[PDB]
């Protein structure tokens, strides 16, 4: 399964699954500051799933590793902004992270394999 380009549609499909998860709703658009006035005092680099999908569709990811770094920033931002590890929204982030990691592992493996096969000679 040595298609170097296959990761892109596999990531589009996984983002569609994430958008169907009720657990994604807080992460689907950039945070608003009128409701969370201290956000940018805590979080240096905001990230959300609409920004990830737009970056993919623009052709501005070169690999699934880059997409994975931005998705993991969504989750690290939630863990750093949360006032409690028992937060509703943080709790939603941890379920969504487990789902994402379960599904991204084969996408990363297949891409890295494809690149090694390309450079086999
Ligand atoms: O306002 C939004 N998101 C809506 C615009 C879709 N968020 C999601 C990100 N936040 C957190 O990760 C968090 C952890 C604990 C409490 O919030 C702040 C609130």
Curated annotation (Swiss-Prot):
Entry-annotated residues carrying Phosphoserine: 1, 91
Parent sequence residues shown: 1315 to 1435 of 1821
Domain Bromo: 2-107
Species of provenance: Homo sapiens
Subunit structure: Interacts with IRS1 and IRS2. Interacts (via bromo domain) with acetylated lysine residues on histone H1.4, histone H3 and H4 (in vitro).
Clinical note on disease: Chung-Jansen syndrome: An autosomal dominant disorder characterized by developmental delay, intellectual disability, autistic features, anxiety, hypotonia, obesity, and dysmorphic features.
Protein name per its UniProtKB record: PH-interacting protein
Subcellular location(s) per record: Nucleus
Phosphothreonine: residues carrying this PTM: 45
Tissue: Expressed in myeloma and epidermoid carcinoma cell lines.
Role this protein plays: Probable regulator of the insulin and insulin-like growth factor signaling pathways. Stimulates cell proliferation through regulation of cyclin transcription and has an anti-apoptotic activity through AKT1 phosphorylation and activation. Plays a role in the regulation of cell morphology and cytoskeletal organization.
């Amino acid at each position: 399964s040595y298609d170097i380009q296959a990761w892109k549609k596999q990531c589009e499909e996984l983002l569609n699954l994430i958008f169907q998860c009720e657990d994604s709703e807080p992460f689907r658009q950039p945070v608003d500051l009128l409701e969370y006035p201290d956000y940018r005092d805590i979080i240096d680099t905001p990230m959300d799933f609409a920004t990830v999908r737009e970056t993919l569709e623009a052709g501005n990811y070169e690999s699934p590793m880059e997409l994975c770094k931005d998705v993991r920033l969504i989750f690290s931002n939630s863990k750093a902004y949360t006032p409690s590890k028992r937060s509703r929204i943080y709790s939603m982030s941890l379920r969504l992270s487990a789902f994402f990691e379960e599904h991204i592992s084969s996408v990363l493996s297949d891409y890295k394999s494809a690149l090694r096969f390309h450079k086999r000679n």
